[PDB]
């Protein structure tokens, strides 16, 4: 039973435009690269699994990192301190009871002290101007799922899987807004599992034609094909579990017919 789903979906579309990371930010970072970012984000996936965190906590942490790295220059020896701080803040915002700070220090193999993590948390807050309720691919995917006919567990878990893979690679996926990635993810899960397409209901609601989703749907397809060969494997392993209906073992379509 909705009443303001339309209001919320409108408002989330306003916010994602304002809470968007600067697209070409890694070119202006002297010491760090997209490949370093891929390792950090992948480590955060393992931290989530180890501490039984929410998939949304992950999405928010990556958004914090990308926004912080958009305005502050960071050296490689401090990139993990930024990420830990991001995850601690995303945990305080989204989890009922977040892990203690002591735990966030132990996951870093005591590279940083409790002092430094607490200090970065404060710097991250200041840089982000306390704006932590950011729209995520995970959020839009949850809304989009209400337009399934009918509901399918494999579609949902597959859509999520493809949505998380986009978090690893800034190299294409920072030019797409969360809503667009969520759309590409949703179509590709639907198509692979049941042969269905991006539904008419969502075309009218979002204003995204399947054709407008094509550029993003292409990149995500390649990623899905290349996934088992990627340098980073934490997300594939995570989605091999029975709690996500083993969606990562499934065979990607060879073509998309667009």
């Amino acid at each position: 039973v909705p009443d303001y789903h339309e209001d919320i979906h409108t408002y989330l579309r306003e916010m994602e435009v304002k809470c968007k990371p600067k697209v070409g930010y890694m070119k202006k970072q002297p010491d760090i690269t997209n490949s370093m970012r891929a390792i950090l984000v992948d480590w955060l996936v393992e931290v989530g699994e180890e501490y039984k965190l929410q998939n949304e906590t992950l999405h928010l942490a990556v958004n914090y990192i990308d926004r912080f790295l958009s305005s502050m220059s960071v050296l490689r020896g401090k990139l993990q301190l930024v990420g830990t701080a991001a995850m601690l803040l995303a945990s305080k915002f989204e989890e009922i009871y977040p892990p203690e700070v002591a735990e966030f220090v132990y996951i870093t193999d005591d590279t940083y002290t409790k002092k430094q993590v607490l200090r970065m948390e404060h710097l991250v807050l200041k840089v982000l101007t306390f704006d932590l309720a950011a729209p995520t691919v995970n959020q839009f995917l949850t809304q989009y799922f209400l337009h399934q006919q009918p509901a399918n567990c494999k579609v949902e878990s597959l859509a999520m899987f493809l949505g998380e893979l986009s978090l690893i690679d800034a190299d294409p996926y920072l030019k797409y807004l969360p809503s667009v990635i969520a759309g590409a993810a949703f179509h590709l899960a639907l198509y692979t599992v049941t042969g269905q397409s991006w539904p008419e209901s969502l075309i009218r609601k979002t204003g995204y034609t399947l054709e407008s989703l094509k550029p993003c749907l292409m990149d995500l397809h390649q990623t899905y094909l290349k996934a088992p060969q990627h340098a980073q494997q934490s997300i594939r392993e995570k989605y091999k579990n029975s709690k996500y209906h083993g969606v990562s073992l499934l065979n990607p379509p060879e073509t998309l017919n667009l």
């Binding site: 209001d7 408002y11 989330l12 949304e56 915002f93 203690e100 404060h122 306390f130 309720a133 949850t142």
Partner: protein
């Protein structure tokens, strides 16, 4: 902080002590919520993280205005607009005499407008209670204390070790459902509405089972017909007594027919059938809403 002068302590919230203060330069009277941030704790508390972030998205006459956040090494201050007092105090002071009906209806209308604004901006308050609702001398009432407030872009999961009110807790939460919804805030506002009218708390329970039995004995024991799924909920027991719904006229006597119709749609058992904030604002009860001022 140099520009603020602490006048007096006005209370304690969900993380720190609050003072009335004045800007020495502009003259504006404010409310300073101070959180101690030494070295060793868990850092900036989650209650502070949520109130600041959610509250700075919400700009509306019926929601407290977070004016500035002052950020230092060892303390963090939240500067709010000052309001005169809270509802709970105004209720106790207006006990026996009663809060005038027109002021009740004005207050609920304003509370519903603030709640409709929150929900359309995907914010659950989760802790609506008289102590968290603030009033001024002009007749305004405002939602406050967003420390336990959550963003529900993704469904908000249920606590269990709780940390919420009771008294103003929704039955579906007491019966063990997995998720909160915007319906729990409307349940709270229904209880407060009844409380202003009867001059006393509607369901003052001492535990979770005690709280359910207080709801049950006023609205009847829910069954599959009024609330399908209710017998397959975790904390539901078939040994629960079978009580009958009392006539609403004996629960809130001083209320007219339009009022009782509204209150009954806010205290509906099934969260899906429970009236939304938006829908409540269109209710005939608020057809003659005026803006009277309290005797403060």
């Amino acid at each position: 902080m140099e520009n603020f002068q602490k006048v007096e302590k006005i209370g304690e919230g969900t993380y720190g002590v609050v003072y009335k203060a004045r800007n020495k330069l502009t003259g504006e009277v404010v409310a300073l919520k101070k959180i101690r941030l030494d070295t060793e704790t868990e850092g900036v508390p989650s209650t502070a993280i949520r109130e600041i972030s959610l509250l700075k998205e919400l700009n509306h006459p019926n929601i407290v205005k977070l004016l500035d956040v002052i950020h230092t090494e060892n303390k963090l201050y939240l500067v709010f607009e000052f309001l005169h007092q809270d509802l709970k105090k105004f209720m106790d002071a207006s006990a026996l005499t009663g809060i005038p009906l027109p002021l009740i209806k004005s207050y609920l209308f304003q509370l519903l407008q603030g709640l409709a604004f929150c929900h359309s901006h995907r914010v659950l308050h989760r802790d609506l209670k008289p102590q968290n609702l603030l009033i001024n001398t002009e007749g305004a009432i405002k939602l406050a204390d967003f420390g336990l407030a959550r963003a529900f872009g993704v469904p908000v999961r249920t606590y269990t070790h709780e940390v919420v009110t009771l008294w103003y807790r929704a039955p579906e939460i007491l019966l063990g459902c997995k998720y909160y919804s915007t319906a729990v805030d409307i349940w709270s506002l229904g209880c407060i509405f009844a409380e202003m009218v009867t001059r006393r708390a509607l369901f003052p329970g001492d535990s979770e089972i005690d709280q359910l039995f207080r709801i049950f004995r006023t609205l009847g024991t829910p069954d599959e017909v009024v609330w399908p799924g209710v017998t397959s909920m975790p904390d539901y027991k078939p040994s629960f007594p079978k009580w009958a719904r009392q006539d609403f006229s004996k629960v809130v006597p001083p209320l007219d027919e339009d009022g009782r119709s509204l209150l009954s749609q806010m205290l509906h058992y099934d969260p899906n059938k429970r009236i939304s904030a938006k829908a409540a604002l269109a209710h005939p009860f608020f057809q003659d809403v005026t803006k009277p001022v309290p005797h403060l």
